[PDB]
Amino acid sequence: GEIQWMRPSKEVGYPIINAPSKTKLEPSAFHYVFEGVKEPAVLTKNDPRLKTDFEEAIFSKYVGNKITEVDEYMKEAVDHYAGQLMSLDINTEQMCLEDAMYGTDGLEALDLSTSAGYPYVAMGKKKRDILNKQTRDTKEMQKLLDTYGINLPLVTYVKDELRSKTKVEQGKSRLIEASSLNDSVAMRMAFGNLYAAFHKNPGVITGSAVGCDPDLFWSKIPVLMEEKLFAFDYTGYDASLSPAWFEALKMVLEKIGFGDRVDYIDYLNHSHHLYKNKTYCVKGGMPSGCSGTSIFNSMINNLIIRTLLLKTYKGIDLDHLKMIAYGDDVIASYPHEVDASLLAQSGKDYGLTMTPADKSATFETVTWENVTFLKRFFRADEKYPFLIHPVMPMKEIHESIRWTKDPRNTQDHVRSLCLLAWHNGEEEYNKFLAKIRSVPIGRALDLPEYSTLYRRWLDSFG
RNA sequence: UCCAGGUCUCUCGCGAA
RNA sequence: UGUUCGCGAGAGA
RNA sequence: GGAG
Ligand SMILES: [Zn+2]
Protein backbone atom coordinates (compact mmCIF):
# COMPACT_ATOMS: atom_id res chain seq x y z
CA GLY A 1 0.00 0.00 0.00
CA GLU A 2 1.30 3.45 -0.93
CA ILE A 3 0.31 7.10 -0.78
CA GLN A 4 0.19 8.41 -4.35
CA TRP A 5 -0.21 12.07 -3.41
CA MET A 6 -1.25 14.27 -0.48
CA ARG A 7 -2.30 17.92 -0.40
CA PRO A 8 -4.38 20.30 1.71
CA SER A 9 -8.13 19.86 1.10
CA LYS A 10 -8.27 23.66 0.42
CA GLU A 11 -6.54 23.37 -2.97
CA VAL A 12 -9.30 21.01 -4.10
CA GLY A 13 -12.45 22.07 -2.34
CA TYR A 14 -12.80 19.21 0.13
CA PRO A 15 -13.78 20.40 3.59
CA ILE A 16 -11.63 20.18 6.71
CA ILE A 17 -12.76 17.55 9.23
CA ASN A 18 -12.15 17.96 12.97
CA ALA A 19 -12.00 15.00 15.25
CA PRO A 20 -12.15 15.69 18.96
CA SER A 21 -8.53 16.27 19.99
CA LYS A 22 -8.79 14.74 23.44
CA THR A 23 -9.39 11.14 24.41
CA LYS A 24 -12.71 10.06 25.93
CA LEU A 25 -10.65 7.63 28.00
CA GLU A 26 -10.31 8.52 31.69
CA PRO A 27 -8.99 6.52 34.69
CA SER A 28 -11.76 4.45 36.25
CA ALA A 29 -12.55 3.69 39.88
CA PHE A 30 -10.29 0.62 39.60
CA HIS A 31 -7.29 2.47 38.14
CA TYR A 32 -5.00 1.79 41.16
CA VAL A 33 -6.30 -1.61 42.16
CA PHE A 34 -4.74 -3.29 39.10
CA GLU A 35 -1.32 -2.99 37.49
CA GLY A 36 -1.19 -2.20 33.76
CA VAL A 37 1.06 -0.41 31.26
CA LYS A 38 -1.20 0.90 28.50
CA GLU A 39 -2.48 4.47 28.14
CA PRO A 40 -4.66 6.49 25.67
CA ALA A 41 -3.33 6.58 22.10
CA VAL A 42 -1.73 9.69 20.70
CA LEU A 43 -4.53 11.57 18.95
CA THR A 44 -2.84 14.85 17.90
CA LYS A 45 0.62 16.10 17.07
CA ASN A 46 1.09 18.55 19.96
CA ASP A 47 0.96 15.70 22.48
CA PRO A 48 3.90 15.94 24.95
CA ARG A 49 4.51 12.16 25.10
CA LEU A 50 5.57 12.12 21.45
CA LYS A 51 9.27 11.31 20.92
CA THR A 52 8.91 11.45 17.09
CA ASP A 53 6.89 13.04 14.26
CA PHE A 54 3.25 12.00 14.43
CA GLU A 55 2.07 12.10 10.80
CA GLU A 56 5.32 10.50 9.72
CA ALA A 57 4.63 7.66 12.15
CA ILE A 58 0.95 7.05 11.36
CA PHE A 59 1.40 6.99 7.61
CA SER A 60 4.60 4.92 7.81
CA LYS A 61 2.49 1.73 7.41
CA TYR A 62 2.16 2.48 3.71
CA VAL A 63 5.38 0.62 3.00
CA GLY A 64 4.86 0.49 -0.76
CA ASN A 65 3.59 -1.99 -3.31
CA LYS A 66 5.84 -5.00 -3.91
CA ILE A 67 4.11 -6.90 -6.70
CA THR A 68 1.61 -5.89 -9.38
CA GLU A 69 1.09 -9.24 -11.09
CA VAL A 70 -0.90 -12.37 -10.36
CA ASP A 71 1.62 -15.20 -10.64
CA GLU A 72 0.94 -18.86 -11.11
CA TYR A 73 1.06 -19.64 -7.42
CA MET A 74 -1.58 -16.99 -6.67
CA LYS A 75 -3.70 -18.35 -9.56
CA GLU A 76 -3.55 -21.84 -8.08
CA ALA A 77 -4.36 -20.47 -4.61
CA VAL A 78 -7.35 -18.76 -6.21
CA ASP A 79 -8.55 -21.93 -7.87
CA HIS A 80 -8.27 -23.99 -4.70
CA TYR A 81 -9.91 -21.37 -2.46
CA ALA A 82 -12.69 -20.73 -5.02
CA GLY A 83 -13.34 -24.46 -5.41
CA GLN A 84 -13.70 -24.74 -1.60
CA LEU A 85 -16.28 -21.90 -1.42
CA MET A 86 -18.30 -23.24 -4.37
CA SER A 87 -19.40 -26.12 -2.11
CA LEU A 88 -21.27 -23.64 0.14
CA ASP A 89 -23.65 -22.86 -2.77
CA ILE A 90 -23.60 -19.18 -1.94
CA ASN A 91 -26.55 -17.10 -3.07
CA THR A 92 -25.12 -14.76 -5.68
CA GLU A 93 -28.14 -12.56 -6.27
CA GLN A 94 -28.03 -8.91 -5.21
CA MET A 95 -29.28 -8.32 -1.69
CA CYS A 96 -32.31 -5.96 -1.83
CA LEU A 97 -31.90 -2.41 -0.53
CA GLU A 98 -34.14 -3.01 2.49
CA ASP A 99 -32.21 -6.13 3.51
CA ALA A 100 -28.93 -4.29 2.86
CA MET A 101 -29.86 -1.42 5.18
CA TYR A 102 -31.74 -3.20 7.90
CA GLY A 103 -30.19 -6.63 8.04
CA THR A 104 -31.44 -10.19 7.53
CA ASP A 105 -30.53 -13.78 8.46
CA GLY A 106 -26.74 -13.69 8.89
CA LEU A 107 -26.16 -9.94 8.42
CA GLU A 108 -26.96 -7.30 11.04
CA ALA A 109 -28.29 -3.87 10.22
CA LEU A 110 -26.20 -0.79 9.54
CA ASP A 111 -25.09 0.86 12.82
CA LEU A 112 -27.05 4.08 13.38
CA SER A 113 -24.84 4.77 16.32
CA THR A 114 -21.92 5.70 14.12
CA SER A 115 -20.96 8.36 11.59
CA ALA A 116 -22.47 8.49 8.12
CA GLY A 117 -19.15 9.53 6.68
CA TYR A 118 -18.68 11.80 3.69
CA PRO A 119 -20.44 13.96 2.74
CA TYR A 120 -23.06 13.73 5.49
CA VAL A 121 -20.37 14.48 8.07
CA ALA A 122 -19.87 17.88 6.45
CA MET A 123 -23.55 18.85 6.92
CA GLY A 124 -24.17 17.50 10.41
CA LYS A 125 -26.20 14.74 8.85
CA LYS A 126 -26.34 11.49 10.80
CA LYS A 127 -27.55 7.98 9.84
CA ARG A 128 -30.54 8.46 12.17
CA ASP A 129 -31.74 11.22 9.80
CA ILE A 130 -31.96 8.73 6.97
CA LEU A 131 -32.64 5.28 8.40
CA ASN A 132 -35.44 4.07 10.61
CA LYS A 133 -35.31 0.47 11.86
CA GLN A 134 -38.90 0.42 13.06
CA THR A 135 -40.34 1.01 9.58
CA ARG A 136 -37.48 -0.38 7.47
CA ASP A 137 -38.08 2.62 5.21
CA THR A 138 -35.76 2.75 2.18
CA LYS A 139 -37.20 5.78 0.38
CA GLU A 140 -34.77 8.46 1.55
CA MET A 141 -31.75 6.16 1.25
CA GLN A 142 -32.67 5.32 -2.30
CA LYS A 143 -32.86 9.04 -3.10
CA LEU A 144 -29.59 9.81 -1.30
CA LEU A 145 -28.06 6.89 -3.30
CA ASP A 146 -29.10 8.35 -6.60
CA THR A 147 -27.88 11.80 -5.57
CA TYR A 148 -24.31 11.26 -4.41
CA GLY A 149 -23.75 7.90 -6.06
CA ILE A 150 -20.93 5.65 -4.87
CA ASN A 151 -17.13 5.45 -4.65
CA LEU A 152 -16.91 8.44 -2.28
CA PRO A 153 -13.78 9.38 -0.30
CA LEU A 154 -13.10 7.85 3.13
CA VAL A 155 -12.70 10.02 6.25
CA THR A 156 -9.53 9.12 8.16
CA TYR A 157 -9.72 9.19 11.97
CA VAL A 158 -7.33 8.17 14.73
CA LYS A 159 -8.70 5.35 16.84
CA ASP A 160 -9.27 6.40 20.43
CA GLU A 161 -7.87 3.35 22.27
CA LEU A 162 -5.40 2.04 24.86
CA ARG A 163 -1.92 1.56 23.50
CA SER A 164 1.46 0.25 24.64
CA LYS A 165 3.80 2.84 26.19
CA THR A 166 6.30 2.16 23.41
CA LYS A 167 3.56 2.65 20.81
CA VAL A 168 2.44 5.86 22.44
CA GLU A 169 5.87 7.50 22.39
CA GLN A 170 6.77 6.12 18.98
CA GLY A 171 3.44 7.53 17.82
CA LYS A 172 2.24 4.28 16.35
CA SER A 173 -1.46 5.15 16.54
CA ARG A 174 -3.98 3.25 14.45
CA LEU A 175 -6.11 4.77 11.70
CA ILE A 176 -9.78 4.35 10.93
CA GLU A 177 -11.31 4.99 7.50
CA ALA A 178 -14.90 6.09 7.87
CA SER A 179 -16.86 4.58 5.04
CA SER A 180 -19.61 6.63 3.46
CA LEU A 181 -23.17 5.49 4.19
CA ASN A 182 -23.64 5.28 0.41
CA ASP A 183 -20.74 2.96 -0.14
CA SER A 184 -21.67 0.81 2.85
CA VAL A 185 -25.11 0.38 1.33
CA ALA A 186 -23.92 -0.33 -2.23
CA MET A 187 -21.41 -2.84 -0.90
CA ARG A 188 -24.06 -4.68 1.06
CA MET A 189 -26.37 -4.82 -1.95
CA ALA A 190 -23.55 -6.36 -3.96
CA PHE A 191 -22.08 -8.66 -1.31
CA GLY A 192 -24.58 -9.04 1.53
CA ASN A 193 -25.38 -12.62 0.50
CA LEU A 194 -21.67 -13.35 0.49
CA TYR A 195 -21.38 -11.76 4.00
CA ALA A 196 -24.39 -13.77 5.14
CA ALA A 197 -22.97 -17.09 3.90
CA PHE A 198 -19.68 -16.46 5.67
CA HIS A 199 -21.32 -15.38 8.93
CA LYS A 200 -23.35 -18.58 8.98
CA ASN A 201 -20.34 -20.74 8.19
CA PRO A 202 -17.43 -20.11 10.55
CA GLY A 203 -14.87 -22.88 9.96
CA VAL A 204 -12.38 -24.53 7.56
CA ILE A 205 -14.48 -24.25 4.42
CA THR A 206 -14.88 -20.42 4.59
CA GLY A 207 -11.46 -20.40 6.20
CA SER A 208 -13.02 -17.72 8.46
CA ALA A 209 -14.15 -17.28 12.09
CA VAL A 210 -16.36 -14.23 11.45
CA GLY A 211 -19.73 -15.12 12.97
CA CYS A 212 -18.48 -17.50 15.70
CA ASP A 213 -18.94 -17.47 19.46
CA PRO A 214 -15.57 -18.28 21.07
CA ASP A 215 -17.36 -19.71 24.12
CA LEU A 216 -18.75 -22.49 21.91
CA PHE A 217 -16.52 -22.40 18.87
CA TRP A 218 -13.29 -23.10 20.76
CA SER A 219 -14.47 -26.72 21.22
CA LYS A 220 -14.98 -27.25 17.46
CA ILE A 221 -11.62 -25.86 16.38
CA PRO A 222 -9.37 -28.80 17.45
CA VAL A 223 -11.60 -31.26 15.58
CA LEU A 224 -11.36 -29.11 12.44
CA MET A 225 -7.57 -28.83 12.49
CA GLU A 226 -4.84 -31.13 11.20
CA GLU A 227 -2.18 -32.81 13.32
CA LYS A 228 0.46 -30.07 13.02
CA LEU A 229 -0.35 -26.43 13.64
CA PHE A 230 1.40 -23.39 12.27
CA ALA A 231 0.85 -19.68 12.86
CA PHE A 232 2.60 -16.31 12.69
CA ASP A 233 2.04 -12.57 13.02
CA TYR A 234 1.80 -9.95 10.23
CA THR A 235 3.32 -6.46 10.42
CA GLY A 236 0.85 -3.90 9.06
CA TYR A 237 -1.17 -6.55 7.22
CA ASP A 238 -3.82 -4.25 5.69
CA ALA A 239 -1.57 -1.50 4.42
CA SER A 240 1.10 -3.93 3.19
CA LEU A 241 -1.38 -5.62 0.75
CA SER A 242 -0.44 -4.99 -2.92
CA PRO A 243 -2.91 -4.47 -5.82
CA ALA A 244 -2.20 -8.03 -7.14
CA TRP A 245 -3.86 -9.34 -4.00
CA PHE A 246 -6.90 -7.26 -4.94
CA GLU A 247 -6.80 -8.79 -8.46
CA ALA A 248 -6.72 -12.35 -7.06
CA LEU A 249 -9.67 -11.59 -4.78
CA LYS A 250 -11.65 -10.40 -7.83
CA MET A 251 -10.77 -13.64 -9.56
CA VAL A 252 -12.20 -15.63 -6.65
CA LEU A 253 -15.36 -13.53 -6.71
CA GLU A 254 -15.70 -13.96 -10.50
CA LYS A 255 -15.29 -17.68 -9.93
CA ILE A 256 -17.99 -17.97 -7.33
CA GLY A 257 -20.45 -15.80 -9.23
CA PHE A 258 -19.94 -12.20 -8.04
CA GLY A 259 -18.41 -11.34 -11.40
CA ASP A 260 -20.64 -8.45 -12.36
CA ARG A 261 -19.55 -6.43 -9.28
CA VAL A 262 -15.78 -6.96 -8.92
CA ASP A 263 -15.38 -3.27 -9.88
CA TYR A 264 -16.23 -2.43 -6.26
CA ILE A 265 -13.00 -4.18 -5.31
CA ASP A 266 -11.13 -1.56 -7.35
CA TYR A 267 -12.58 1.10 -5.05
CA LEU A 268 -10.97 -0.54 -2.05
CA ASN A 269 -7.62 -0.98 -3.81
CA HIS A 270 -7.62 2.61 -5.10
CA SER A 271 -9.01 4.82 -2.36
CA HIS A 272 -9.11 8.59 -1.63
CA HIS A 273 -8.97 9.92 1.91
CA LEU A 274 -9.73 13.00 3.98
CA TYR A 275 -7.53 13.38 6.99
CA LYS A 276 -8.00 16.64 8.95
CA ASN A 277 -6.87 19.32 6.49
CA LYS A 278 -5.38 16.99 3.93
CA THR A 279 -6.64 14.96 0.99
CA TYR A 280 -4.57 11.99 -0.09
CA CYS A 281 -4.71 9.07 -2.52
CA VAL A 282 -3.70 5.49 -1.71
CA LYS A 283 -3.09 2.70 -4.21
CA GLY A 284 -2.96 -0.72 -2.66
CA GLY A 285 -3.80 -1.34 1.00
CA MET A 286 -7.15 -2.44 2.36
CA PRO A 287 -9.03 0.41 4.01
CA SER A 288 -9.85 -0.52 7.59
CA GLY A 289 -13.41 0.75 7.70
CA CYS A 290 -15.02 -0.26 4.42
CA SER A 291 -17.91 -2.65 4.16
CA GLY A 292 -16.77 -6.27 4.18
CA THR A 293 -13.21 -5.56 5.34
CA SER A 294 -13.52 -8.41 7.87
CA ILE A 295 -14.74 -10.83 5.14
CA PHE A 296 -12.30 -9.59 2.47
CA ASN A 297 -9.15 -9.47 4.60
CA SER A 298 -9.92 -13.00 5.75
CA MET A 299 -10.43 -14.22 2.20
CA ILE A 300 -7.26 -12.53 1.15
CA ASN A 301 -5.50 -14.31 4.10
CA ASN A 302 -6.72 -17.67 2.79
CA LEU A 303 -5.12 -16.78 -0.57
CA ILE A 304 -1.83 -15.58 0.90
CA ILE A 305 -1.27 -18.72 2.93
CA ARG A 306 -2.15 -21.12 0.09
CA THR A 307 0.17 -19.14 -2.16
CA LEU A 308 3.08 -19.24 0.24
CA LEU A 309 2.55 -22.99 0.88
CA LEU A 310 2.64 -23.65 -2.90
CA LYS A 311 5.72 -21.46 -3.34
CA THR A 312 7.50 -23.00 -0.36
CA TYR A 313 6.43 -26.66 -0.50
CA LYS A 314 6.19 -27.64 -4.16
CA GLY A 315 3.30 -29.87 -5.20
CA ILE A 316 1.64 -29.53 -1.77
CA ASP A 317 -1.90 -30.95 -1.63
CA LEU A 318 -3.96 -27.99 -0.37
CA ASP A 319 -6.98 -30.20 0.35
CA HIS A 320 -5.27 -31.06 3.62
CA LEU A 321 -4.72 -27.43 4.67
CA LYS A 322 -6.97 -26.59 7.60
CA MET A 323 -6.87 -22.92 8.47
CA ILE A 324 -9.10 -20.32 10.10
CA ALA A 325 -8.61 -16.61 9.71
CA TYR A 326 -10.23 -13.57 11.24
CA GLY A 327 -8.82 -10.67 9.27
CA ASP A 328 -5.04 -10.97 9.63
CA ASP A 329 -5.36 -13.22 12.64
CA VAL A 330 -5.04 -16.91 11.76
CA ILE A 331 -4.66 -20.43 13.07
CA ALA A 332 -3.58 -23.00 10.44
CA SER A 333 -2.72 -26.71 10.35
CA TYR A 334 -1.21 -29.29 7.96
CA PRO A 335 -0.84 -33.10 8.27
CA HIS A 336 2.95 -32.62 8.18
CA GLU A 337 4.86 -29.85 10.01
CA VAL A 338 5.34 -26.50 8.18
CA ASP A 339 7.96 -23.90 9.04
CA ALA A 340 6.55 -20.39 9.51
CA SER A 341 10.13 -19.14 9.13
CA LEU A 342 10.19 -20.38 5.55
CA LEU A 343 6.82 -18.87 4.64
CA ALA A 344 7.86 -15.51 6.06
CA GLN A 345 10.79 -15.42 3.67
CA SER A 346 8.59 -16.26 0.66
CA GLY A 347 6.26 -13.61 2.08
CA LYS A 348 8.80 -10.89 1.44
CA ASP A 349 8.57 -11.70 -2.27
CA TYR A 350 4.84 -10.91 -2.10
CA GLY A 351 5.15 -7.69 -0.09
CA LEU A 352 4.25 -9.28 3.23
CA THR A 353 6.22 -8.86 6.44
CA MET A 354 5.72 -11.94 8.64
CA THR A 355 7.04 -12.34 12.18
CA PRO A 356 6.74 -15.07 14.85
CA ALA A 357 3.32 -15.62 16.43
CA ASP A 358 2.57 -13.54 19.54
CA LYS A 359 5.61 -11.32 19.57
CA SER A 360 8.00 -14.20 20.34
CA ALA A 361 11.51 -13.20 19.32
CA THR A 362 12.13 -16.50 17.56
CA PHE A 363 10.26 -18.75 15.15
CA GLU A 364 9.34 -21.76 17.27
CA THR A 365 6.90 -24.67 17.33
CA VAL A 366 3.21 -23.75 17.60
CA THR A 367 1.43 -26.16 19.96
CA TRP A 368 -1.94 -26.41 21.65
CA GLU A 369 -0.21 -25.01 24.73
CA ASN A 370 0.94 -21.72 23.23
CA VAL A 371 -1.32 -21.10 20.22
CA THR A 372 -3.63 -18.04 20.33
CA PHE A 373 -6.54 -16.88 18.28
CA LEU A 374 -8.60 -13.72 18.83
CA LYS A 375 -6.24 -13.09 21.75
CA ARG A 376 -7.30 -16.26 23.57
CA PHE A 377 -5.49 -19.49 24.54
CA PHE A 378 -6.98 -23.03 24.36
CA ARG A 379 -7.44 -24.95 27.64
CA ALA A 380 -9.58 -28.04 28.09
CA ASP A 381 -12.04 -28.17 31.02
CA GLU A 382 -10.69 -30.33 33.84
CA LYS A 383 -14.00 -32.17 34.20
CA TYR A 384 -15.06 -32.48 30.54
CA PRO A 385 -11.81 -32.47 28.51
CA PHE A 386 -13.45 -32.25 25.10
CA LEU A 387 -14.76 -28.83 26.20
CA ILE A 388 -12.31 -26.06 25.46
CA HIS A 389 -11.95 -22.81 27.36
CA PRO A 390 -11.07 -19.74 25.33
CA VAL A 391 -8.60 -18.14 27.69
CA MET A 392 -7.76 -14.47 27.62
CA PRO A 393 -4.81 -13.74 29.90
CA MET A 394 -5.89 -11.66 32.95
CA LYS A 395 -3.37 -9.00 31.95
CA GLU A 396 -5.54 -7.87 29.03
CA ILE A 397 -8.55 -7.71 31.33
CA HIS A 398 -6.49 -5.73 33.85
CA GLU A 399 -5.55 -3.11 31.26
CA SER A 400 -9.18 -2.67 30.28
CA ILE A 401 -10.73 -2.26 33.74
CA ARG A 402 -8.36 0.59 34.59
CA TRP A 403 -9.93 2.98 32.10
CA THR A 404 -13.47 4.00 31.07
CA LYS A 405 -15.08 6.34 28.52
CA ASP A 406 -18.11 6.85 30.74
CA PRO A 407 -18.47 5.70 34.43
CA ARG A 408 -22.15 5.28 33.60
CA ASN A 409 -21.06 2.06 31.97
CA THR A 410 -19.05 0.66 34.88
CA GLN A 411 -21.53 -2.11 35.79
CA ASP A 412 -21.85 -3.36 32.26
CA HIS A 413 -18.16 -2.96 31.44
CA VAL A 414 -17.01 -4.95 34.48
CA ARG A 415 -19.60 -7.68 34.00
CA SER A 416 -18.41 -8.14 30.41
CA LEU A 417 -14.91 -8.50 31.75
CA CYS A 418 -16.01 -11.24 34.16
CA LEU A 419 -17.44 -13.26 31.30
CA LEU A 420 -13.99 -13.23 29.74
CA ALA A 421 -12.05 -13.59 32.99
CA TRP A 422 -13.50 -16.76 34.54
CA HIS A 423 -12.11 -19.19 31.94
CA ASN A 424 -8.86 -18.61 33.78
CA GLY A 425 -10.10 -20.85 36.58
CA GLU A 426 -11.85 -20.51 39.93
CA GLU A 427 -8.73 -19.51 41.80
CA GLU A 428 -7.96 -16.65 39.43
CA TYR A 429 -11.58 -15.61 39.03
CA ASN A 430 -12.26 -15.32 42.77
CA LYS A 431 -9.07 -13.30 43.15
CA PHE A 432 -10.29 -10.97 40.37
CA LEU A 433 -13.60 -10.53 42.19
CA ALA A 434 -11.58 -9.92 45.37
CA LYS A 435 -9.55 -7.05 43.90
CA ILE A 436 -12.70 -5.53 42.35
CA ARG A 437 -14.64 -5.72 45.59
CA SER A 438 -11.73 -4.07 47.40
CA VAL A 439 -13.12 -0.64 46.36
CA PRO A 440 -16.57 0.54 47.32
CA ILE A 441 -17.88 0.83 43.76
CA GLY A 442 -16.81 -2.78 43.18
CA ARG A 443 -19.06 -3.87 46.05
CA ALA A 444 -21.95 -2.07 44.41
CA LEU A 445 -21.81 -4.25 41.28
CA ASP A 446 -23.89 -7.37 40.64
CA LEU A 447 -21.20 -9.88 39.75
CA PRO A 448 -21.65 -13.55 38.67
CA GLU A 449 -20.25 -16.27 40.88
CA TYR A 450 -17.88 -18.77 39.25
CA SER A 451 -20.26 -21.70 39.80
CA THR A 452 -22.94 -19.73 37.96
CA LEU A 453 -20.78 -19.07 34.94
CA TYR A 454 -19.50 -22.69 34.68
CA ARG A 455 -23.01 -24.17 34.87
CA ARG A 456 -24.38 -21.71 32.34
CA TRP A 457 -21.40 -22.48 30.10
CA LEU A 458 -21.97 -26.26 30.21
CA ASP A 459 -25.68 -25.69 29.68
CA SER A 460 -25.15 -23.57 26.54
CA PHE A 461 -23.76 -26.66 24.75
CA GLY A 462 -27.27 -28.14 24.76
C1' U B 1 -22.52 24.66 26.16
C1' C B 2 -23.37 20.14 23.68
C1' C B 3 -22.47 16.84 19.50
C1' A B 4 -18.24 14.77 16.78
C1' G B 5 -14.53 9.39 16.35
C1' G B 6 -15.17 3.22 10.58
C1' U B 7 -16.51 -1.87 9.29
C1' C B 8 -18.09 -6.27 11.40
C1' U B 9 -18.71 -10.37 14.71
C1' C B 10 -19.93 -12.41 19.36
C1' U B 11 -21.53 -11.73 24.30
C1' C B 12 -23.68 -9.53 28.48
C1' G B 13 -27.16 -5.84 30.37
C1' C B 14 -31.77 -2.91 29.80
C1' G B 15 -36.70 -1.74 27.37
C1' A B 16 -40.57 -3.44 24.69
C1' A B 17 -44.55 -6.74 21.23
C1' U C 1 -37.23 -18.69 30.73
C1' G C 2 -38.57 -19.20 24.53
C1' U C 3 -38.73 -16.23 20.63
C1' U C 4 -38.78 -11.45 17.49
C1' C C 5 -37.58 -6.27 17.58
C1' G C 6 -35.24 -1.71 19.51
C1' C C 7 -31.24 0.44 22.90
C1' G C 8 -26.65 0.44 25.61
C1' A C 9 -21.83 -1.58 26.67
C1' G C 10 -17.36 -4.70 26.46
C1' A C 11 -14.14 -7.52 23.93
C1' G C 12 -11.92 -9.27 19.40
C1' A C 13 -10.38 -8.70 14.26
C1' G D 1 -15.43 20.16 12.66
C1' G D 2 -21.47 20.23 13.20
C1' A D 3 -25.65 22.45 15.16
C1' G D 4 -27.93 25.77 18.98
ZN1 LIG E 1 -6.34 8.50 -6.79
Author numbering: 1 to 462
Cite, word for word, the article reporting this structure.
The replication of positive-strand RNA viruses relies on virally encoded RNA-dependent RNA polymerases (RdRPs) that are capable of rapid and processive synthesis of the 7–14 kilobase viral genomes. To examine this in further detail and to validate the polymerase–RNA interactions seen in the initial poliovirus EC structures, we here present nine new coxsackievirus, rhinovirus, and poliovirus elongation complex structures at resolutions ranging from 2.1 to 2.9 Å. All the complexes feature an upstream RNA duplex that is pinched between the pinky finger and thumb domains such that the RNA exit channel is opened by ≈4 Å as compared to the polymerase alone structures. All of the complexes show the open conformation for the active site wherein the β-strands of motifs A and C are not hydrogen bonded together to fully form the RMM-fold that is commonly utilized by polymerase active sites.
Expanding on the r2 construct, the length of the upstream RNA duplex between the two ECs was shortened from 26 to 24 (r3) and 22 (r4) base pairs, and both these RNAs resulted in poliovirus EC crystals that diffracted to 2.4 Å (PV_r3) and 2.8 Å (PV_r4) resolution. Despite this common lattice organization, the different dumbbell pairs and their RNA-RNA junctions displayed a multitude of geometries in the different crystal forms; for example, the junctions in the PV EC structures range from near perfect coaxial stacking to highly disordered structures that could not be fully modeled into the electron density maps. A comparison of all the RNA-RNA junctions, shown in Figure 3, reveals geometries ranging from fairly straight and essentially canonical coaxial stacking (PV_r3, CV_r2) to slightly offset helical ends (PV_r1) to highly distorted geometries with frayed ends (PV_r5+2).
